Write a protein that binds this ligand. Structure first.
Ligand SMILES: CC(=O)Nc1ccc(O)cc1
Length: 490
């Protein structure tokens, strides 16, 4: 294959130097998807002819010396969760009742708009759980997205299809969305790099309600290299007056790749003082943290002092996400797609529990959750009063086995403590409360399966996160572990 395992940086140079046509990039990527995706079950929509059309036009511009974009010829896919691209489907993570829906003219999600704007080629959409409402990827319409490191296990979620394609070498970058960790969760379970930007760094369009009570929502890349993530972030970030959090700031993310971390003060936590975390993960992260000490950074353990239990916090997150989920379900029912009645089977019971719970949620309850959120925000800020960076495990547990009922979920206990199987073990959701940028960096393998370390920066310190990530990547590479999916039976 001319493109299998090639980086985005490599493909851009192959295309711009005219070593390979955009046409061949598309046909070769299609070959890989048809050959390798049957096992992964990561792709839920194929836009092959559209990509072929775009490649023909890109090829003409290249041969004629007309202007081309920063990501010219890079193949990618977007996530099927609140997906908006004209003419494309949007099933909200495998809701069968929505299978015939198609995007209206002029309405775009950020990832497909901006990536295609710089001449990346969109080949289709990737699998997500229903309404993104769990840290695994499975649903009863498309099924589970499986882990390239072991297909008996789940890829993670909700951006599981995105991470699976990237970890299997099929595309160098894929788009994720993140409301409780969905860029970072599947990255951790698949040995890939998931970058969740500062709130307001990448435009997020929430309509009809831009002022909803949900957590911070992000769009961001999943890649195999930090450089590819920096390139994608150069495209994705930027001012958009229609996002009420948007930052009117221009950055060069590639400028941070060679910065290093010498002299940086780094805080370390193994469980944020409140989560049950599998011991093997704690040990791996303790080792990973010491990589920064060899690089000239000063690392020490920190206590965030979070006064809430992890169950209180996951319950609050579920209610926060459920309110806009309910708004969507009510809107759909008004347009003739009734997920409460006729198509109730399309909604997982675990989700409907929260849908029912917030149907007439009181202002007192809304307020209590906002107070919790504020407390977590301030606990995070307390760290960045004194430290440059915070390190933690991305997740409290290793990948789970796929179920056969379309409802793969996480564990309901870790170390004998009860934990919410949908999101409780996804410690990532703290930054959806707080707004800080963070990235999941591959920390190694435990019994042949990947585990991630989360690097968190100060508010708007995206470049610090990139700098630390690239430094770690150099000193503690993870690319060798791709030998496992590269050699898997097809
Ligand atoms: C795990 C997670 O982030 N889920 C999720 C992602 C996007 C969204 O809009 C709602 C929920």
């Amino acid at each position: 294959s001319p493109v299998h395992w090639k980086s985005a940086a490599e493909i851009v140079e192959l295309v711009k130097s005219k070593q390979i046509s955009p046409r061949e990039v598309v046909e070769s990527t299609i070959d890989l998807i048809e050959q390798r995706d049957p096992g992964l079950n990561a792709v839920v929509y194929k836009a092959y002819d559209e990509a072929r059309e775009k490649a023909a036009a890109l090829e003409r511009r290249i041969m004629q010396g007309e202007p081309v974009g920063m990501l010219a010829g890079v193949p990618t896919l977007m996530k099927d969760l609140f997906a908006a691209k004209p003419g494309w489907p949007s099933t909200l993570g495998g809701i069968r009742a929505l299978k015939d829906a198609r995007g209206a003219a002029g309405v775009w999600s950020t990832y497909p708009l901006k990536m295609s704007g710089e001449d990346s080629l969109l080949l289709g959409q990737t699998n997500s759980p229903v309404y993104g409402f769990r840290g695994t990827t499975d649903n009863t319409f498309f099924g589970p997205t499986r882990n390239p490191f072991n297909l008996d296990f789940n890829a993670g979620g909700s951006s599981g299809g995105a991470a699976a394609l990237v970890a299997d070498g099929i595309v160098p970058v894929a788009g994720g969305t993140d409301g409780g960790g969905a860029i970072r969760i599947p990255a951790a379970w698949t040995n890939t790099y998931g970058f969740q930007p500062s709130i307001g760094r990448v435009p997020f369009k929430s309509r009809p309600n831009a002022f909803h009570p949900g957590p911070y929502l992000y769009e961001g890349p999943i890649t195999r290299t930090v450089r590819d993530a920096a390139l994608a972030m150069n495209v994705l970030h930027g001012f958009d007056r229609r996002d009420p959090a948007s930052l009117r700031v221009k950055l060069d993310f590639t400028s941070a790749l060679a910065q290093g971390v010498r002299g940086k003060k780094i805080g370390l936590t193994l469980n944020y003082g409140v989560f049950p975390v599998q011991q093997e993960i704690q040990d791996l992260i303790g080792k990973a943290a010491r990589v920064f000490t060899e690089l000239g950074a000063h690392v020490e353990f920190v206590d965030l002092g979070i006064p809430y239990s992890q169950k209180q916090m996951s319950d609050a997150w579920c209610r926060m996400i459920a309110i806009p989920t309910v708004a969507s379900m009510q809107a759909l029912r008004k347009e003739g797609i009734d997920l409460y009645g006729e198509h109730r089977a399309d909604i997982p019971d675990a989700l409907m529990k929260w849908i029912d719970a917030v149907a007439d949620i009181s202002v007192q309850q809304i307020s209590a959750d906002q107070l919790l959120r504020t407390t977590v925000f301030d606990c995070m800020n307390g760290v960045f009063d004194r430290f440059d960076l915070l390190l933690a495990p991305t997740l409290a547990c290793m990948p789970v086995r796929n179920a056969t009922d379309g409802c793969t979920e996480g564990p309901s206990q870790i170390n004998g403590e009860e934990i919410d199987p949908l999101i409780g073990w996804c410690m990532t959701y703290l930054t959806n409360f707080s707004g800080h940028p963070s990235a999941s960096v591959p920390a190694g393998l435990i019994d042949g399966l990947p585990a991630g370390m989360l690097i968190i920066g100060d508010r708007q310190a995206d470049l610090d996160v990139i700098a630390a990530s690239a430094a770690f990547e150099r000193a503690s590479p993870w690319s060798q572990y791709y030998d496992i999916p590269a050699g898997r039976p097809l």
